[PDB]
Amino acid sequence: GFLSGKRILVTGVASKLSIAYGIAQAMHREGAELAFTYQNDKLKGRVEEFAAQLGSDIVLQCDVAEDASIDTMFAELGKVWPKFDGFVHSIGFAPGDQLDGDYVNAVTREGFKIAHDISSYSFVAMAKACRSMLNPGSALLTLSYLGAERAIPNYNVMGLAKASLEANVRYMANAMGPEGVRVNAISAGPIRTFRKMLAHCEAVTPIRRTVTIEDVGNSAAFLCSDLSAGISGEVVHVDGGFSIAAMN
Amino acid sequence: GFLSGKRILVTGVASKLSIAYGIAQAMHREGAELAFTYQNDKLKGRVEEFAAQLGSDIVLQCDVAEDASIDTMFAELGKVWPKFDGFVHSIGFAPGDQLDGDYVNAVTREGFKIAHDISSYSFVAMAKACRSMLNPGSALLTLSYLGAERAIPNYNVMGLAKASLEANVRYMANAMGPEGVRVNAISAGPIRTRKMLAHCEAVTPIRRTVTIEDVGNSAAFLCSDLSAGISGEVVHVDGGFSIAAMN
Amino acid sequence: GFLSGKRILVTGVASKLSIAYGIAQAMHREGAELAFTYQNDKLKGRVEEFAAQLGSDIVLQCDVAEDASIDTMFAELGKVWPKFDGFVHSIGFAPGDQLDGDYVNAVTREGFKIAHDISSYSFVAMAKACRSMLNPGSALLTLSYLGAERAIPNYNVMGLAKASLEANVRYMANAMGPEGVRVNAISAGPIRTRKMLAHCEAVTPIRRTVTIEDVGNSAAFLCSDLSAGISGEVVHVDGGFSIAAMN
Amino acid sequence: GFLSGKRILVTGVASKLSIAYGIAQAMHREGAELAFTYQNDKLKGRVEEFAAQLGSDIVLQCDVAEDASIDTMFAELGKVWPKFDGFVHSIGFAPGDQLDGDYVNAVTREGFKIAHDISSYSFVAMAKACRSMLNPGSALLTLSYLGAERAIPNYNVMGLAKASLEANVRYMANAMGPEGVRVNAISAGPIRTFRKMLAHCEAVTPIRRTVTIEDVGNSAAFLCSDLSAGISGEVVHVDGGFSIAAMN
Numbered sequence: 001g002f003l004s005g006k007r008i009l010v011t012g013v014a015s016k017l018s019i020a021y022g023i024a025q026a027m028h029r030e031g032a033e034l035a036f037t038y039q040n041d042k043l044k045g046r047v048e049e050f051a052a053q054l055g056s057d058i059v060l061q062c063d064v065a066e067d068a069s070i071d072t073m074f075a076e077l078g079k080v081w082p083k084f085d086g087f088v089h090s091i092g093f094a095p096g097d098q099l100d101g102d103y104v105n106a107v108t109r110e111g112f113k114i115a116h117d118i119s120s121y122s123f124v125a126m127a128k129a130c131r132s133m134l135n136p137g138s139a140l141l142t143l144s145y146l147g148a149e150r151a152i153p154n155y156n157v158m159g160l161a162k163a164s165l166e167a168n169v170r171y172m173a174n175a176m177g178p179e180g181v182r183v184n185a186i187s188a189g190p191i192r193t194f195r196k197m198l199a200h201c202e203a204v205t206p207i208r209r210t211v212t213i214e215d216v217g218n219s220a221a222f223l224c225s226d227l228s229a230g231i232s233g234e235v236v237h238v239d240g241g242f243s244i245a246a247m248n
Numbered sequence: 249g250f251l252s253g254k255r256i257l258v259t260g261v262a263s264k265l266s267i268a269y270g271i272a273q274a275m276h277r278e279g280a281e282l283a284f285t286y287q288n289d290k291l292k293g294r295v296e297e298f299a300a301q302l303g304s305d306i307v308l309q310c311d312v313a314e315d316a317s318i319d320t321m322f323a324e325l326g327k328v329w330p331k332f333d334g335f336v337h338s339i340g341f342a343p344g345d346q347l348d349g350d351y352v353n354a355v356t357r358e359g360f361k362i363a364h365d366i367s368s369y370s371f372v373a374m375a376k377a378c379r380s381m382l383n384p385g386s387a388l389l390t391l392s393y394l395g396a397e398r399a400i401p402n403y404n405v406m407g408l409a410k411a412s413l414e415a416n417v418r419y420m421a422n423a424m425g426p427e428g429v430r431v432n433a434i435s436a437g438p439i440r441t442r443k444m445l446a447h448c449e450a451v452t453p454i455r456r457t458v459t460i461e462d463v464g465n466s467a468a469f470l471c472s473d474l475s476a477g478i479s480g481e482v483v484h485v486d487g488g489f490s491i492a493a494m495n
Numbered sequence: 496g497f498l499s500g501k502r503i504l505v506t507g508v509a510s511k512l513s514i515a516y517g518i519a520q521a522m523h524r525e526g527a528e529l530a531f532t533y534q535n536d537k538l539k540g541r542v543e544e545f546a547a548q549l550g551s552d553i554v555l556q557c558d559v560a561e562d563a564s565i566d567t568m569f570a571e572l573g574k575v576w577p578k579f580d581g582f583v584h585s586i587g588f589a590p591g592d593q594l595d596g597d598y599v600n601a602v603t604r605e606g607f608k609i610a611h612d613i614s615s616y617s618f619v620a621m622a623k624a625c626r627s628m629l630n631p632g633s634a635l636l637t638l639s640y641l642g643a644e645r646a647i648p649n650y651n652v653m654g655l656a657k658a659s660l661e662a663n664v665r666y667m668a669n670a671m672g673p674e675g676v677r678v679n680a681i682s683a684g685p686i687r688t689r690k691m692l693a694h695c696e697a698v699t700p701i702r703r704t705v706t707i708e709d710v711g712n713s714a715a716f717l718c719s720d721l722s723a724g725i726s727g728e729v730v731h732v733d734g735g736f737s738i739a740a741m742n
Numbered sequence: 743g744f745l746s747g748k749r750i751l752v753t754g755v756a757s758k759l760s761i762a763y764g765i766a767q768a769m770h771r772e773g774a775e776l777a778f779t780y781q782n783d784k785l786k787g788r789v790e791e792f793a794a795q796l797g798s799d800i801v802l803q804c805d806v807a808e809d810a811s812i813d814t815m816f817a818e819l820g821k822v823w824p825k826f827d828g829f830v831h832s833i834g835f836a837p838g839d840q841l842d843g844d845y846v847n848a849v850t851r852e853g854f855k856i857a858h859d860i861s862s863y864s865f866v867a868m869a870k871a872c873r874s875m876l877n878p879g880s881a882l883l884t885l886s887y888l889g890a891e892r893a894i895p896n897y898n899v900m901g902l903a904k905a906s907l908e909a910n911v912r913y914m915a916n917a918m919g920p921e922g923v924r925v926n927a928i929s930a931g932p933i934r935t936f937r938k939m940l941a942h943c944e945a946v947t948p949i950r951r952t953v954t955i956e957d958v959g960n961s962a963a964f965l966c967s968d969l970s971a972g973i974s975g976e977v978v979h980v981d982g983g984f985s986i987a988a989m990n
């Protein structure tokens with residue numbers, strides 16, 4: 001596979017529906033050696049077994065809200081991989097009350113802080129903590145959403161956090177490029193991981209279907225492989241062309 | 249002039265060189281009645297003098313880091329302006345260590361938190377706190393910068409906070425549009441007040457850096473009923489710098 | 496008003512509903528002296544009457560399909576305005592068959608050629624033909640549309656021609672900036688004058704379609720010294736429509 | 743390879759330095775069956791032999807200035823491939839006088855017409871002429887340049903033609919998507935196929951090198967493969983992050 005010889009850490013695997021699962025799947029298909037993180041001691045067993053099916057028993061706890069947890073995860077990772085070739089950041093959160101109704105009425109100082117901290121800062125917090133561990137030719141990948149670029153009802157403060165995240169992609173690419181690391185995002189179309197949101201995108205997307213975790217995983221695999229050696233700092237739309245049409 | 253009849257609150261005046269100052273001068277030139285905030289004790293006197301020179305004695309304390317300080321400022325404002333026509337948000341900050349050197353090395357969780365809180369969250373915090381006071385036809389304005397869109401050396405986490413601020417403009421414009429409020433930003437070129445300035449002078453299509461007068465005249469337009477068809481827009485007032493490459 | 500002292504040429508007036516008409520009214524309201532072109536014999540009378548109502552008797556024929564017609568129009572213009580301050584380009588056309596149905600089936604080599612020639616090339620053709628006549632401080636303006644940026648059904652090859660027109664704005668702004676000329680576009684929302692209009696009304700943040708008055712007030716700003724810090728910009732005057740999704 | 747079972751037409755191969763060559767190379771590496779066009783009876787032998795090295799003796803004359811030539815090329819192609827899975831458009835031209843000096847002084851009605859006709863219209867002229875021949879899952883690819891988005895000295899009217907071309911990508915994707923065809927562009931960084939232009943991009947690009955025809959070919963291969971099934975109507979920057987940095 002075109003990831004042979006690569007070791008990639010994959011965050012965000014929570015179930016077989018997770019975008020991160022589809023990415024891990026495609027990467028394993030392409031010959032990558034994988035490691036997995038999990039947020040809390042609840043997902044622990046569930047992720048250990050997803051890992052197993054994908055050639056791996058590197059399953060490590062990490063809450064990205066805490067610098068200590070990120071450090072201790074990469075110290076653990078360093079025991080089996082003193083060096084490695086990048087990671088997939090597939091993590092986001094905002095408090096539930098943030099994401100319903102009029103944006104201005106819903107947003108709070110605290111809601112804004114957590115959304116940005118978990119959905120955007122954590123991407124660079126992970127890069128900081130593993131920087132000396134990355135091989136030349138490493139690639140970092142995060143997952144964004146059209147909410148960054150357009151005002152979408154209910155998406156609310158997550159849109160700001162995703163915009164911060166896409167700028168984070170650019171400043172990371174810029175800072176880490178000279179030492180041979182690429183940094184990109186995929187802006188994915190909607191996937192079941194909102195019933196009206198999915199339905200709308202299907203009717204008006206150029207490809208006339210919603211994208212799958214397989215489509216996103218294949219794009220992800222490519223973007224973390226040396227095939228994409230020419231691509232850095234880019235948000236690639238894997239939404240079947242939805243964002244480039246209007247009034248279909 | 250073209251803002252006669254409008255009541256506009258102007259934040260962020262700190263000196264005669266402040267963008268907010270060029271904006272307040274331009275708006276007063278166009279007949280706006282103005283009100284002013286100041287952040288702390290150190291700036292109160294400067295802002296009173298500027299306000300007096302521009303016909304105003306509404307000078308109110310406001311530290312956008314705190315919800316209570318925004319709320320009491322608007323309660324104070326409501327005694328003289330029970331309704332008004334919008335505000336200019338000309339505020340941002342990141343701790344000094346954030347803005348020098350390699351971005352990935354410089355940024356910290358706390359530095360990121362403050363940059364976004366002060367430079368982005370505060371725009372919608374002010375809007376939330378005065379929403380019921382805004383007349384139909386109101387306009388809100390904030391100030392952003394090309395670092396929101398491109399990776400600029402040393403700008404670092406402030407680029408992320410400005411990107412969050414630009415999306416805030418879109419989300420606020422969309423939320424507030426139905427009750428008659430527009431929300432825009434000006435992405436200003438760097439203002440001569442250091443290596444970046446010499447660069448922008450040479451390669452900007454109009455062959456100079458923009459001034460606070462340029463910015464102020466665009467800002468007054470964007471807060472006036474002349475810009476009635478413009479909302480959720482980041483307008484580049486950088487002399488065309490951003491749209492050129494390899495000049 | 497804010498265009499006193501400016502001499503601006505206005506193309507594209509065809510009726511009281513023309514965007515160019517709202518623009519000419521707004522500029523005359525702001526003290527500009529105006530000049531007018533008309534495309535052909537059929538429109539001459541309408542444009543003379545409008546010009547007279549707005550204080551002008553400079554009404555000149557110009558078909559931008561031909562180099563000689565642009566050159567003689569500007570030679571005519573130079574007898575009354577040896578120098579002047581810019582022009583509003585409000586011209587586009589594609590043959591009728593281009594603009595209905597599947598894009599790939601509708602477009603032809605000839606239809607593409609004409610759409611780009613008339614709707615894009617003509618902006619720089621006019622600029623070339625009057626370059627030496629423009630005062631420092633001059634501004635050129637053209638009218639574009641969201642189809643330049645997104646695939647819109649039925650707009651078809653006109654979207655490609657508008658994209659070429661937007662890049663023309665950037666290349667002209669960059670070329671002409673050093674001698675004191677700015678060049679911008681307004682990307683106007685669809686104006687009520689059919690299913691698209693009902694759509695834009697419901698989902699546009701300001702909850703209405705923009706009017707030729709909205710467009711005209713932005714255009715007058717962009718041709719005035721108030722927009723001195725703005726060049727090579729496509730400003731969206733569509734009420735925020737383009738920056739929202741799934742409304 | 744991830745193009746196995748695909749048949750792709752590749753235009754624009756003029757020499758071993760051509761972007762189209764690097765694309766053909768990568769595609770053949772990935773198992774695609776190839777066909778090649780050539781502009782004039784001069785390149786004929788030279789292209790026939792490039793083809794041979796890449797598993798192919800489908801080498802067909804085509805001048806994209808002429809509808810008849812495009813039609814007769816696809817009729818010929820139809821003799822060996824009644825159906826096929828898309829094509830690479832790697833064609834552009836403007837008269838030499840267009841591309842030097844002040845844009846406004848250099849541009850002419852005729853220069854503008856030819857630049858747009860050859861660099862932009864020809865992409866959709868090819869799609870029109872082979873539409874009934876495309877399999878579901880087909881992909882079309884063209885090559886653009888940052889000149890479309892920014893004003894670059896000397897690039898002049900080619901910038902307008904490339905902007906027209908990128909809009910063409912979107913309207914094509916929109917029109918052809920429902921019948922199962924994707925359409926994308928790669929905006930490539932500078933490649934030797936200007937000595938100061940290359941040099942500048944090397945110093946200030948995040949990856950600190952200019953991209954190669956191999957980087958572009960690998961991205962091209964991906965974008966014409968089913969791995970990119972989620973991507974349509976997109977201009978992918980394969981310029982090593984150059985366009986997303988400023989003042990480096």
Ligand SMILES: [N]C(=O)C1=[C][N+]([C]2O[C]([C]OP(=O)([O-])OP([O])(=O)O[C][C]3O[C](N4[C]=NC5=C4N=[C]N=C5[N])[C]([O])[C]3[O])[C]([O])[C]2O[B@@]2([O])C3=C([C]=[C][C]=[C]3)[C]=NN2C([N])=O)=[C][C]=[C]1
Nearest residue numbers: 012014018019039063064091092093143145188190191193
């Ligand atoms: N889905 C869709 O459609 C989309 C998405 N996106 C994105 O991506 C990401 C991922 O997510 P998903 O896959 O989808 O889901 P899940 O599976 O559930 O996952 C999540 C995750 O995360 C994590 N976390 C949290 N928190 C935390 C964590 N970790 C660690 N630490 C901490 N603290 C968990 O665990 C899991 O695993 C994301 O990012 C997304 O985004 B978003 O915003 C969205 C959605 C939807 C739609 C849109 C958007 C969802 N979600 N989100 C979030 N969360 O953020 C993109 C596109 C599309």
Ligand SMILES: [N]C(=O)C1=[C][N+]([C]2O[C]([C]OP(=O)([O-])OP([O])(=O)O[C][C]3O[C](N4[C]=NC5=C4N=[C]N=C5[N])[C]([O])[C]3[O])[C]([O])[C]2O[B@@]2([O])C3=C([C]=[C][C]=[C]3)[C]=NN2C([N])=O)=[C][C]=[C]1
Nearest residue numbers: 260261262266267287311312339340341391393436438439
């Ligand atoms: N300059 C230039 O070039 C620019 C700018 N920009 C922007 O805008 C704004 C404003 O700025 P300026 O005017 O310039 O400055 P100053 O005067 O200093 O001011 C500021 C203000 O704020 C305030 N604050 C703070 N914090 C706070 C406040 N208030 C309240 N509360 C609180 N807490 C003070 O007081 C004053 O007044 C801004 O936003 C800006 O941005 B930035 O980032 C930038 C710069 C430069 C360049 C670029 C950018 C600077 N600064 N910044 C900040 N700070 O943020 C835009 C464009 C341009």
Ligand SMILES: [N]C(=O)C1=[C][N+]([C]2O[C]([C]OP(=O)([O-])OP([O])(=O)O[C][C]3O[C](N4[C]=NC5=C4N=[C]N=C5[N])[C]([O])[C]3[O])[C]([O])[C]2O[B@@]2([O])C3=C([C]=[C][C]=[C]3)[C]=NN2C([N])=O)=[C][C]=[C]1
Nearest residue numbers: 507508509513514534558559586587588638640683685686
């Ligand atoms: N409307 C709306 O919605 C819009 C529009 N836009 C644009 O802008 C311009 C103008 O339009 P309007 O005003 O609307 O129309 P009218 O009135 O018809 O006008 C036109 C003009 O032009 C001229 N021409 C032609 N050809 C020629 C000329 N001149 C000279 N020479 C030659 N050859 C006539 O005469 C008249 O005056 C334009 O550009 C527009 O665009 B488009 O595309 C559109 C529409 C609609 C919608 C969208 C778009 C219509 N039309 N168009 C054309 N035509 O092109 C913008 C936005 C909006």
Ligand SMILES: [N]C(=O)C1=[C][N+]([C]2O[C]([C]OP(=O)([O-])OP([O])(=O)O[C][C]3O[C](N4[C]=NC5=C4N=[C]N=C5[N])[C]([O])[C]3[O])[C]([O])[C]2O[B@@]2([O])C3=C([C]=[C][C]=[C]3)[C]=NN2C([N])=O)=[C][C]=[C]1
Nearest residue numbers: 754756760761781805806833834835885887930932933935
């Ligand atoms: N190079 C670089 O850097 C770049 C490029 N790009 C693009 O891509 C394409 C391709 O080109 P190249 O590869 O580069 O080159 P070559 O090899 O030489 O090729 C060309 C071709 O074409 C053809 N043709 C022409 N005409 C015609 C034809 N065919 C057919 N028919 C007709 N009529 C020939 O044969 C050959 O093969 C292109 O498109 C490009 O673009 B551009 O604009 C550019 C350049 C440079 C830089 C930039 C840009 C060059 N060139 N070009 C043109 N031509 O167009 C992209 C990016 C980069």
